[PDB]
Amino acid sequence: PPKLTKQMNAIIDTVINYKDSSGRQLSEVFIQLPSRKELPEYYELIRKPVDFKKIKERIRNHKYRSLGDLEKDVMLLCHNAQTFNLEGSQIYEDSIVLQSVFKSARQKIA
């Protein structure tokens, strides 16, 4: 894979595999979007749904032209998670943590 592809894969893998001190993987509920039939209220509130599988697909198929493009989609995922999930809830807070994990990973790798 090209250099930029390896960098994005390492950045997103750091975010995906991030665990809290108890070993809980924060990204697990964000890997795959709920189906429209299982959670229609998700699609009523979220205009541009995205999950970590979609982000990995966009890295794999070279859809991000820069690290900034990758960041925009990770920030969109976190923004969608904060929009849908209750403020103060574990999922809402986990998406704030993952924004910071992404930013530190982007700086560490590139």
Ligand SMILES: O=c1nc2n(c3cccc(Cl)c13)-c1ccc(C3CCNCC3)cc1C21CCCCC1
């Ligand atoms: O904002 C999100 N929000 C969550 N999910 C997301 C998936 C991908 C990206 C994002 Cl950013 C989210 C998501 C997915 C599946 C379920 C379930 C998995 C079990 N069977 C039914 C669908 C749930 C969820 C929640 C919403 C409901 C509360 C838990 C987290």
Ligand SMILES: [Zn+2]
């Ligand atoms: Zn390729």
